Design a protein around this ligand. Structure first.
Ligand SMILES: COC(=O)c1ccccc1Cc1cn(C)nc1-c1cc(Cl)nc(N)n1
Length: 453
């Protein structure tokens, strides 16, 4: 069976949630379902990226880094996939997976997903941290006529965020609702101080229990688990055949430079690089009460403005995420074929413009934007059959921490400040705060703009 069609290469960049969806053209588009979520945090992906920028790697640092990264990440991905999970998104520091099932099956699937989590830790004995949640999930699709983005939002998402930030290395933490829904007969746990979540210590199945048979019966409930003559494929998406309307929808989710590689119009290694870029990390905050029905339209309206300004200032959205009631856009200036000599001025002017517009979007409570510039790793991270263009580096992390620790304003780092072709009074030096995992930032600045108010 031939399976290397463009439509299949595109599907590698996308989860089944999207590949096998049937969304209306309305934007935003929202659907609702139940599932189990797994969030995997890898530690070290910070440490080593800065190591691979060393002269030791003789200008092959990016190539060496993506190689060892994909070696470790693709092992996690195939464990997720063989246990029937759908990898939703990659960040440089993590991936989020989903088991979507009917509510009656959540209890059994949690057991599957806990075994899956234990075998992932078994790969590394470099380490990982895992948080699990279960419950209601809302999916949000937003975009315009040529670009689409998705998010998951809701109960189980907020819960998986809770569980993930308590975990330490080698932990598997269960959401309070996952603990309440799971088969406590079979899972041995320990309480975590000052918390209602639990840590999983052991999986203790009854004497009769056979996990392989158990798993096989659970695949009964997985619509897209490969079986029969496709039982040794990692994804059913590998079997997709050419279908112009489906490819038309799917390609809207993928950045243009990726599509050019998919079409064999660019060397397949062109996108692995340590490159100077400016990161513009945009956070849109909503109130705790807000429902997904109201968040979706706000994000759509914000997005319609973000995308138009990015095009003017030649930036791109690399990743969208949401947690802690905040939707964040990882924007990048100076991507593989998009470097300009006034890049820094443009990143700030684009930030300020995004700030001013989104701050007048109804239901958005706070806009916060961090700007940082420097060498970041760029590349396609994951497994052959499931992977995504991602940016990694201290500057990515610094921009993200700035928008968190300095809410409601536009901040920038010292590189962006000194290297902008703007006068100093457009800026304000800021009190330097201690920030998680950020070792002396340098001086930071608020981008005040051209006039006092
Ligand atoms: C540090 O905490 C987290 O990153 C985090 C923790 C818990 C939930 C979500 C995120 C954000 C996140 C990371 N990844 C790799 N993917 C996402 C993501 C993907 C999708 Cl489809 N929808 C939403 N809402 N988030």
């Amino acid at each position: 069976e031939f399976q290397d069609w463009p439509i299949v290469r595109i599907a590698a960049h996308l989860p089944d949630l999207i590949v096998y969806g049937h969304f209306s053209p309305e934007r935003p588009f929202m659907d609702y379902f139940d599932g189990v979520l797994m969030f995997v945090d890898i530690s070290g992906f910070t440490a080593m990226t800065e190591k691979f920028s060393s002269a030791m790697y003789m200008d092959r640092g990016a190539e060496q880094l993506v190689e060892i990264l994909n070696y470790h990440i693709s092992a996690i991905v195939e464990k997720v996939l063989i246990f029937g999970g759908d990898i939703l998104k990659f960040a440089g520091d993590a991936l989020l997976a989903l088991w979507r099932v009917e509510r009656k099956q959540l209890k059994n699937i949690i057991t599957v997903v806990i075994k899956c989590s234990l075998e992932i830790h078994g790969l590394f004995e470099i380490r990982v941290k895992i948080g699990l949640a279960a419950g209601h999930i809302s999916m949000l699709v937003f975009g315009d006529e040529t670009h689409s983005h998705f998010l998951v939002i809701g109960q189980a998402v907020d819960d998986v965020r809770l569980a993930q930030n308590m975990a330490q290395m080698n932990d598997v933490i269960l959401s309070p609702n996952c603990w309440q829904l799971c088969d406590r007969s079979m899972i041995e746990i320990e309480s975590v101080p000052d918390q209602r979540a639990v840590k999983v210590n052991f999986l203790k199945p009854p004497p009769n229990f056979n996990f392989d048979e158990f798993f096989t019966k659970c695949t009964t409930f997985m619509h897209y688990y490969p079986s029969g003559e496709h039982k040794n494929l990692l994804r059913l998406a590998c079997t997709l055949k050419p279908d112009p309307e489906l490819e038309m929808s799917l390609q809207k989710y993928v950045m243009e430079s990726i599509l050019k590689q998919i079409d064999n119009k660019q060397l397949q290694g062109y996108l692995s690089e340590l490159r100077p870029v400016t990161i513009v990390f945009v956070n849109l905050m909503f109130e705790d009460q807000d429902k997904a029905e109201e968040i979706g339209p706000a994000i759509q309206d914000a997005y319609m403005h973000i995308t138009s300004v990015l095009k003017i200032f030649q930036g791109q959205i690399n990743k969208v995420f949401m947690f802690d009631k905040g939707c964040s856009f990882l924007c990048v200036f100076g991507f593989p074929g998009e470097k300009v000599p006034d890049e820094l001025t443009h990143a700030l002017e684009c930030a300020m413009d995004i700030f001013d517009f989104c701050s007048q979007v109804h239901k958005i409570q706070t806009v916060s934007i961090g700007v940082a510039s420097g060498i970041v790793f760029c590349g396609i991270v994951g497994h052959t059959v499931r992977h995504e263009y991602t940016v990694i580096g201290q500057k990515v992390n610094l921009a993200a921490r700035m928008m968190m620790y300095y809410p409601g304003i536009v901040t920038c780092d010292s590189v962006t400040y000194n290297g902008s072709n703007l006068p100093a009074y457009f800026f304000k030096e800021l009190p330097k705060k201690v920030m998680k995992g950020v070792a002396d930032s340098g001086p930071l600045y608020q981008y005040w703009g051209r006039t006092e108010k």
